[PDB]
């Protein structure tokens, strides 16, 4: 995260860490949506252009963290994966369209003050909160600058941007399964996700029922915090039926 501050303990209890076994390195961010399901970005797992194709056995999931490099004994839980499911129409060839994936954990995890799932939005929440100008929050243990890694989880709150503007900032074709967020060069504020923060959540706090809903997943960007550019996020709600389907087809 660039131009974001350190998070507070138990501020994002649903933030998960995909960790590679060998070498032991941070891979991406992810979120806890139930006690057995984690939601992340598909390209954190499969991206043929760079020979990336991870399997169950190659990852670990660490929940309850704050620090990036320490094994926070008695505070974090480390789970294994039982199955990874990538959206069947994820487009890695052209624009990372439907960049979403679900991982089922071997055993359910227990919640604590540091581990808690986030809510997935419903048509009415999605429609009232995804408006331009509304802010969301992103978190992760990714780079602090494009070219510089944090010790603690970082957080940044960014405004959602009007689709025409998102479009007029890139040569990539934007679909309805993505939205972009960030401050205009003109708004005197900065922030963005960066490498290492992919797969993590963009969430909003419903002013109706005080709950936090995950509206987007960190998907892609052109660099990290460049002016005139933005970060693109997968539109969780537009792909929710897919979610529901794997969950009530493969478990809960």
């Amino acid at each position: 995260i660039v131009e974001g501050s350190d998070a507070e303990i138990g501020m994002s209890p649903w933030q998960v860490m995909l960790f590679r076994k060998s070498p032991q390195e941070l891979l991406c961010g992810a979120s806890l949506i139930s006690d057995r399901w984690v939601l992340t970005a598909a390209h954190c797992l499969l991206y043929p252009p760079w020979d990336k194709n991870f399997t169950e056995n190659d990852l670990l999931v660490r929940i309850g963290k704050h620090s990036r490099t320490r094994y926070e004994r008695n505070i974090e839980k480390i789970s294994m994966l039982e199955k990874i499911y990538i959206h069947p129409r994820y487009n890695w060839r052209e624009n990372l369209d439907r960049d979403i994936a679900l991982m089922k954990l071997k055993k359910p995890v227990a919640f604590s003050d540091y581990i808690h799932p986030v809510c997935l939005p419903d048509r009415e929440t999605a429609a009232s909160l995804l408006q331009a100008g509304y802010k969301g929050r992103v978190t992760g243990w990714g780079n602090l600058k494009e070219t510089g890694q944090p010790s603690v989880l970082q957080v940044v709150n960014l405004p959602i941007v009007e689709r025409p503007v998102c479009k007029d900032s890139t040569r990539i074709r934007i679909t309805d399964n993505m939205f972009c967020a960030g401050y205009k060069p003109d708004e005197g504020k900065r922030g963005d996700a960066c490498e290492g923060d992919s797969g993590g959540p963009f969430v909003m706090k419903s002013p109706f029922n005080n709950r936090w809903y995950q509206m987007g997943i960190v998907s892609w960007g052109e660099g990290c915090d460049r002016d005139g550019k933005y970060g693109f996020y997968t539109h969780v709600f537009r792909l929710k039926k897919w979610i529901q389907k794997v969950i009530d087809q493969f478990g809960e």
Partner: peptide, 11 residues
Amino acid sequence: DFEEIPEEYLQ
């Protein structure tokens, strides 16, 4: 950079 984690999580 990361700290060793309990062997039991690799297997």
